[PDB]
Design an enzyme around this catalytic site. Structure first.
Site, PDB file in Angstrom:
ATOM      1  CG  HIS A   1      -8.183  -6.468   6.290  1.00  0.00           C
ATOM      2  ND1 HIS A   1      -8.696  -7.700   6.584  1.00  0.00           N
ATOM      3  CD2 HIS A   1      -7.472  -6.681   5.044  1.00  0.00           C
ATOM      4  CE1 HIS A   1      -8.577  -8.358   5.286  1.00  0.00           C
ATOM      5  NE2 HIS A   1      -7.812  -7.705   4.650  1.00  0.00           N
TER       6      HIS A   1
ATOM      7  CG  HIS B   1       4.236  -8.720   8.308  1.00  0.00           C
ATOM      8  ND1 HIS B   1       3.730  -8.000   7.112  1.00  0.00           N
ATOM      9  CD2 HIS B   1       5.296  -9.274   8.112  1.00  0.00           C
ATOM     10  CE1 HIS B   1       4.947  -8.266   6.169  1.00  0.00           C
ATOM     11  NE2 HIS B   1       5.717  -8.974   6.635  1.00  0.00           N
TER      12      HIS B   1
ATOM     13  CG  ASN C   1      -8.479 -12.511   3.838  1.00  0.00           C
ATOM     14  OD1 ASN C   1      -8.249 -11.943   4.729  1.00  0.00           O
ATOM     15  ND2 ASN C   1      -8.382 -12.207   2.540  1.00  0.00           N
TER      16      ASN C   1
END
Ligand code: HDE
Ligand code: HDE
Ligand SMILES: [S]
Ligand SMILES: [S]
Lengths: 726, 726
Positions: free
Chosen positions: A101, A365, A174
Site C-alpha cells: 500500500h 495498524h 480493503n
C-alpha cells in the site's frame, strides 16, 4: 513582488468545482472546516506569508541564489553553512515507503454513530449519536510503489484512523471482504509473488506476470480474492465509489462482558462504480494520479466522500453454523445469511496541508483497538498484529512514531516509556517505572468497567497442542469463488473472463496458464471454458466432468456481491466533457450547463486549443483543456452541443474522443448538427439506447442524459463495441 | 508443487530474442559472461537448488505454511521465532529511494580505450587499449519515484561506475549536455518545483504543472534545458538510442602536470531515436516498464548496448575564448566549435542477478575521480561534490556504503577509518591512526607521479573575495536555446512547439503561461507565435519587436544538436509486430523472418487470442500476445502477411493496431490481400512513402521495409495524421 497584481495566483477559500481554481493545502482552501484533530495540529502548522527566509536555526538568509565562493567564478567554500544545511535537508528528504500500500491518498473528516450501541459494545466512540470522532482516512493500492499509477487492477486499501476519547482505533480494511491467503506466515510469499520480480523489478502495479499466477496455481486458497481482483472490483471509478471491509471476524464486548463476533463494512453513499479494463489501463498513462486527484477535487468541491459504517453481527453460539469457518479470511459472510446493520456515517471534508507530513508519515495498524473491541484467532489477523508495529521502526525511524503529529491521539496518553530516536515529549515524572512510591504510583492502572476503564482481553477458552497446522475447516477453496461468480451480471461475468484472459496472456510460461485454467474448472465450467478459449487451450474430458463445489449454506447467488445487479447510482460529483466548436449554439449550452449544475454534475469545456471561443450570441466561453489534454477516460459522459460543427467534424482528436467514450460504454449526447458525429461511432438513423439525440438540448434531452449517467455505463452496447477500431 | 516434467519453467542459458524465453538473473542466463567485477561478487552470490529452506540463523524449517498456535484454530504464539524472523525481514525490506533519479535500470559490462591517452591524462583506465575496465551503468529518469513509469517526458540520467586499477571513477551524466540551473544552491528549489506539488503530491513523472513552469518563468537560466526537455530528446525510444553527457567542464591532468579542460560524451552506437509524445504517454499506461524491459531483453538477446566515449578538449589558454563561460553548466560547447574526439567503447553485456541488491543499492557520485582527472569551479559541479556522499548516509544506512557489494572497488583499499553501522571489514592493523610507529606507519601515503601515485589536486590559481555572487559572464540565457531551436529539423521544431503547448495547457494559472510565452519571445518569435496560438494568446507589439539573441560564436545552427538531421540509423535489436491470421501464407512468413533475421531485427507474432494458429503448410505458429496485449506502441513497424485476411479484416483491435502505428509514423508493410487494410488508414491505390505493399513479401518488399526502419519514422506522413481518429 512576483504575484500577479490581479491576485489570480491564489485560489478562492470557498468550495469550487474541479478545474475552476488551482488546488491548495486544506487549511488555506477551507480554513473554517474544523474538527478536534485538525485543531490539535495547530501547534505544528507553519505559515509563510510575511516571514523572512531563514536557516533551520532561525538565521535570516540574504542571498538564496548563490553558494559562497572565492571570487564570483571561484571554488565553493566549506564554510558555506547555509548551502550545506539546505542541501543536507534535501539529501535526506526520503523515508522508506510502506512495504505494501505504498501508493495512497488521504483526507481528514469525522464520524458519528446513528444511535448508541451500548447494548453490544462499550466502545466510547459508538456510545452516543452526539459523539463526533475525527478521522483521517488513507485509501491505497497494494502492489505498486508510492510513485506508481492509481487506476491499476489491484486490491484497494481503505484505512481509517479514529481519534477516540479512549484511544486511537484503526480500522485497516480493503475494498474486498476477503484476502488471498489464510495464514500470516505466508504473507511474504504471497506479497513477493505479486510484487515486481526480483531479477529485474518488473512489472509495476500489476499481477499480470508469471510469479503471481504460479503462486495462485499452487495455492487454491487464493482463488476467492483472485475472482474479486479479476472482476471490475479491481478497477474502481473512484475511492468514493467502492465498498470497504474490515477483512476479519473481530469481537465487540459490551459492559456486561458479552462477546459478539463482528465483520466491519463501509457502504459508499455515492454508489458502487468501476472502470472497464482498457480505460483503466490507458488512464494509468494519461493520468497516473487520477484517483488521488479526484478525491482531492471532490473535497475541494464540497462533494465530500461519505460512507456508512455497518456491522455483520454473529452471536457467540452461532460460531459453527456456517459451511465455512468464521475465522477463515478467505471466506466472506454472505449478506443473505447475515445482514449488515447500519451503525453510523463518516464524511471526509478536508484535504491535508502537506502530503508528506500527514499522508506519507501516517501509521495505521489493526492492533490499535480500544475497550469494547477485541480480536479473534483468525490466523491472518493474528500475524498482522505483529507486523504493523514492527514495520514502523524502520519506516518512521523508531518507536516514537506516535509523536509524529498526524499519529498523535487526541485522548490523553501517559506511561513510563522513555527515550528512543526523535523523542519529543519531555517527561517530568520523577518515576519511569511502576510500581513506584516516589510519584505515588502515577500514572496508574485503571480497572475495566463500562466506560473509561482499562483494557482487558475477553477470556476466550484456548485448548489444543502447540501446532503449526492449518485447521481442516479451512480446507475448502472453490465454493466462495463460485458464489461470487454466480452473483455477477452477464456483463460482469464477461469482464471477469476478460481479466483472467488478459492477465494469463502475460504469463510467459504456458504450463502456468494451463494450471490456472484447471483451477477455474473446479469453480465453474462456463468460466473455465471462456478463459480457455481466449487462451487457445482446450479443456480435457476430465476437466469437463469436475463436479462443481457445493452452494454456500444453500445460496446460489447473493446480489450484494455484484457492483451493478441492484442499482445504487448517484450522479453528484460525476463529470461530463462538452466538446466545443467555434460558434456554439448558446441556448444549447445554457440548458446543458444548468441541468448539470442542478444535479451536482461538473463539466469541462474542451476544444482544439486553449483560450476562448465565442458562441452564436457573443458569449465568451473559457476552455478548460484540449481534446488530447483531457481525454474521455477522465469523464463519465460526453455532450456535443450544436453550432458550427464543421469546425471539429474533421478533427481527428474530436472524433477519437467520441470513439473512445463509446468503446468504454459511456453515455454520449448529440444536439442539432452534432448528430453528424453519429457516422463516426456508426449509429443507425433511428438511434440506439445509450446515445441521447435531439434537434436541441432542451426538453427531455438533459433528463435522458442524466438517467443514463445514473446507471453509470451502457452495458447493452457491449456487443457493438467489439469491432470498433478504437 | 513442482516444475513441469518438460523443463519449460527454465530459460535456456543462451542468447534468445525478446519473448522467446522467460527472463532470468544474469548469472543464470549468461553464466560464461565474466569480468573482474562480476567475478568478485561471487563471495556474496547465493544459489538455491538442492538446498534446505532455513531461517537466517541456519535452522531448517519443517513447515513454511503455518504459524505456531495453541490448537489448529487457536491464537498464534509469541514463541514462533520462525514466523517473526520471516515477517520482521519482510517488514523492513524498503530503504529510502534516491531523492532524484529514483527510477532507473542497470547492467554490467566493460570499457576499453581505442588508444593510449597518456599525452593528455595519466588516468590508468585510459592508458592502454588492452586494458579492460569493468563498468556498472544505471540509466534513470529524474522526477518520478522508483515505481513511476519509464517513457515519461523528463531528462534521463546515464551513470557509469568504472572499476579502475587506481580506484572507482563514476561518470554521472545525463542525456542532454546542460542542466536547468547555474548554482547548486538552487538545486532544491528547482527539484521541488519539478517534483509533485507538496500539498497533494501530484503530478508523478511530469513537469506539466504550475510550480515547474512558475520556476522556469522566473529563472530564464532554465530555458536551455527546457528546450531540450520539450523536444523529442525528452522521450527516448530506448536507453540504447540516446546520447550521454558529463554535464560539466572537468580537467584531464597528464604526467607532466598539464591541465586540459574536458567535457564528456557518450555516443550511442545503435543511433539516436525517440518516441513521439502521444505514443510515449500512452506507453506509460500500456507498459510503464518499457525501457527497463527493453534494456534487459536487448542484453539477453545479445544486442548489447554499446556507447562510444568521446571528449571535447579545450586547452587551458582557451578558457575565455568563447562567448559563453566554459564553467556555466547551462551552456553547451557546440561540436562545430570543438569536435568530439573518440576515446573508447563501452559494451553492456550482462544483467544483474538481484535488482535490489545491485541496482537499488548502487551509489554513484561525480566526486569519485581518479588521478589523471580533476574538477573545475563550475558552481553546479562544486555543490554536487557535497551531495552525493552526504545522501548515502540515510539512503544506504551509513558510511560503510562502499562495502555493499556492487559498490566495492576491485582496486585495493586500506586506510585508518573504522566502525560505522554494519561494518563488514575486520581490520587487523594494530594502528587506526597515522602517523604511527606501531605498524611502521602502514598503510602509507604515496607521492603523486606518472602512474600508481597519490591523488594531488591541480594547483589552480584562486583570486577573489568571499562572495555569494553569480559570475556576470553567466548572465545570458537565450542564445543557446535559440541555437538549439535553429538546429532542429522542421518536424523536430513542430514537436518542441507541441511539447510546450501541451505542458502549458496543464498550467492552471493563466499568467504563468503568459510569462513563459514572453520568455519564448526572447528566444525565437516563430516558436513564440506557434506556442501562443495553441494557448489562445496573442503576442503584443513589444513582444513582436524583441531582438533575437546573438548567434553563438558565429553559428546559425549546429546539426549535431538534432536527433535526426544527420542519418545514423541502426535497425539491429529493433522489433516488428507481425499480425497473424488463422491461415497465414507460410511463403510470406518465411521471407519476412529471413530478411529480419539477416539484419538482427526481432519479430512478435500477434493474434486475436493466445495459443497457436496453423499456417497454410501445417507450420504451427505460437502466439506471443494479442493485438490488445502488445500494442503497436511497443514495436518499430508492423507487417501483415497474406493468407486468410477475412479472419482479421473486421477485427477492431487489428484495424486499430494499424491506425495507432500509422499515427505514430511507423513503417507498415501489407502483403497480398492484407492490402485491404489500406482502407482503414486511407492510403490511395498509388500507395504512399512509408507504406510498403506488394502481391507477396519478397526480397524487394523486405528491403523497402528495412530501409524505412533504418530511418526510424516516416516524418513526411505528419501532415496526413491530423485527420486520423486514433
Ligand atoms: C483486512 C485488510 C488487510 C489485510 C487482510 C492485510 N492488509 Fe496489510 N499491511 C501490513 C502487513 C500485513 C500483514 C502481515 C497481513 C496478513 C498477515 C496483511 N497486511 C494483510 C504491513 C506490512 O504491516 C503494512 C505496511 C506498512 C504498514 O504500516 O503496515 C500494511 C499496510 C496495509 C494498509 C495501508 C494502511 C496505510 O498506511 O494506508 C491497508 C489498508 C492494509 N494493510 C490492509 C490489509
Ligand atoms: C550532469 C548530470 C547531473 C547533474 C548536473 C546533477 N545530477 Fe544528481 N543527484 C544528487 C544530487 C545532485 C545535486 C546537488 C545536483 C546539482 C547541484 C545534481 N544532483 C545535478 C544526489 C541527491 O546526490 C543523488 C540522488 C541519489 C543519489 O545517490 O545521488 C543524485 C543522483 C543522480 C544520478 C543517479 C545515479 C544513480 O544512482 O543511478 C545521476 C545520473 C545524476 N544525479 C546526474 C546529475
Ligand atoms: S482480510
Ligand atoms: S550538467
Amino acid at each position: 513582488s512576483l504575484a500577479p497584481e490581479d491576485g489570480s495566483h491564489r485560489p478562492a477559500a470557498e468550495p469550487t468545482p474541479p478545474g475552476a481554481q488551482p488546488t491548495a493545502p486544506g487549511s488555506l482552501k477551507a480554513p473554517d472546516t474544523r474538527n478536534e484533530k485538525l485543531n490539535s495540529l495547530e501547534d505544528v502548522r507553519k505559515g509563510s506569508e510575511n516571514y523572512a527566509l531563514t536557516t533551520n536555526q532561525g538565521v535570516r538568509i540574504a542571498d538564496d541564489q548563490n553558494s559562497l565562493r572565492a571570487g564570483s567564478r571561484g571554488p565553493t567554500l566549506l564554510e558555506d553553512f547555509i548551502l550545506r544545511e539546505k542541501i543536507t535537508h534535501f539529501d535526506h528528504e526520503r523515508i522508506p515507503e510502506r512495504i505494501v500500500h505504498a501508493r495512497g491518498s488521504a483526507a481528514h473528516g469525522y464520524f458519528q454513530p446513528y444511535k448508541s450501541l451500548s447494548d453490544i459494545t462499550k466502545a466510547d466512540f459508538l456510545s452516543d449519536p452526539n459523539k463526533i470522532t475525527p478521522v483521517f482516512v488513507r485509501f491505497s493500492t497494494v502492489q505498486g510503489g508510492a510513485g506508481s499509477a492509481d487506476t491499476v487492477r489491484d486490491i484497494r486499501g481503505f484505512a481509517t484512523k479514529f481519534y477516540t476519547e479512549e484511544g486511537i482505533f484503526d480500522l485497516v480494511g480493503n475494498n474486498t471482504p476477503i484476502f488471498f491467503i489464510q495464514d500470516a506466515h505466508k504473507f511474504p510469499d504471497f506479497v513477493h509473488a505479486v510484487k515486481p520480480e526480483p531479477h529485474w523489478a518488473i512489472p509495476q502495479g500489476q499481477s499480470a506476470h508469471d510469479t503471481f499466477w504460479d503462486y495462485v496455481s499452487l495455492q487454491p486458497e487464493t482463488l476467492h480474492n483472485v475472482m474479486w481482483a479479476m472482476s471490475d472490483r479491481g478497477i474502481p471509478r473512484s475511492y468514493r465509489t467502492m465498498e470497504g471491509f474490515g477483512c476479519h471476524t473481530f469481537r465487540l464486548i459490551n459492559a456486561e462482558g458479552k462477546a459478539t463476533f463482528v465483520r466491519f463494512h463501509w457502504k459508499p453513499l455515492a454508489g458502487k462504480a468501476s472502470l472497464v479494463w482498457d480505460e483503466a489501463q490507458k488512464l494509468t498513462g494519461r493520468d497516473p494520479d487520477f484517483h488521488r486527484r479526484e478525491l482531492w477535487e471532490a473535497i475541494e468541491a464540497g462533494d465530500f466522500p461519505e460512507y456508512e459504517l455497518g456491522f455483520q453481527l454473529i452471536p457467540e453460539e452461532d460460531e459453527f453454523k456456517f459451511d465455512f469457518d468464521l475465522l477463515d479470511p478467505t471466506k466472506l459472510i454472505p449478506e443473505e445469511l447475515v445482514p449488515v446493520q447500519r451503525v453510523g456515517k463518516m464524511v471526509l471534508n478536508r484535504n491535508p496541508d502537506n502530503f508528506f507530513a500527514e499522508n506519507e508519515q501516517a501509521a495505521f495498524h489493526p492492533g490499535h483497538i480500544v475497550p469494547g473491541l477485541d480480536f479473534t484467532n483468525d490466523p491472518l489477523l493474528q500475524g498482522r498484529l505483529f507486523s504493523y508495529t514492527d514495520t514502523q521502526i524502520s519506516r518512521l525511524g523508531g518507536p516514537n512514531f506516535h509523536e509524529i503529529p498526524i499519529n498523535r491521539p487526541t485522548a490523553p496518553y501517559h506511561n513510563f516509556q522513555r527515550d528512543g530516536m526523535h523523542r519529543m515529549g519531555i517527561d517530568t515524572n520523577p518515576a519511569n517505572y511502576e510500581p513506584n512510591s516516589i510519584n505515588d504510583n502515577w500514572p496508574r492502572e485503571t480497572p475495566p468497567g463500562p466506560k473509561r476503564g482499562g483494557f482487558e482481553s475477553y477470556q476466550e477458552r484456548v485448548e489444543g497442542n502447540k501446532v503449526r497446522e492449518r485447521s481442516p475447516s479451512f480446507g475448502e477453496y472453490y465454493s466462495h469463488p463460485r458464489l461470487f461468480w454466480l452473483s455477477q451480471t452477464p456483463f460482469e461475468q464477461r469482464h471477469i473472463v476478460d481479466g483472467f484472459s488478459f492477465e494469463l496472456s502475460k504469463v510467459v510460461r504456458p504450463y502456468i496458464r494451463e494450471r490456472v485454467v484447471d483451477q477455474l474448472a473446479h469453480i465453474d465450467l462456463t468460466l473455465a471454458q471462456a478463459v480457455a478459449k481466449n487462451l487457445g487451450i482446450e479443456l480435457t474430458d476430465d476437466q469437463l466432468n469436475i463436479t462443481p463445489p457445493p452452494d454456500v449454506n444453500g445460496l446460489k447467488k447473493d446480489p450484494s456481491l455484484s457492483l451493478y445487479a441492484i442499482p445504487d447510482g448517484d450522479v453528484k460529483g460525476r463529470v461530463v466533457a462538452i466538446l466545443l466548436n467555434d460558434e456554439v449554439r448558446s441556448a444549447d449550452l445554457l440548458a446543458i450547463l444548468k441541468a448539470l449544475k442542478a444535479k451536482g454534475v461538473h463539466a469541462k469545456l474542451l476544444y482544439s486549443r486553449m483560450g476562448e471561443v465565442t458562441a452564436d450570441d457573443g458569449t465568451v466561453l473559457p476552455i478548460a483543456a484540449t481534446f488530447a489534454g483531457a481525454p474521455s477516460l477522465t469523464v463519465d459522459a460526453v455532450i456535443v452541443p450544436a453550432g458550427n460543427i464543421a469546425d471539429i467534424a474533421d478533427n481527428g482528436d474530436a472524433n477519437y474522443y467520441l470513439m473512445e467514450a463509446y468503446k468504454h460504454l459511456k453515455p454520449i449526447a448529440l444536439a442539432g448538427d452534432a448528430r453528424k458525429f453519429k457516422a463516426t461511432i456508426k449509429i443507425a438513423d433511428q438511434g440506439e439506447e445509450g446515445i441521447v439525440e435531439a434537434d436541441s438540448a432542451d426538453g427531455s434531452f438533459m433528463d435522458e442524459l442524466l438517467t443514463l449517467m445514473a446507471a453509470h455505463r451502457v452495458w447493452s452496447r457491449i456487443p457493438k463495441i467489439d469491432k470498433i477500431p478504437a
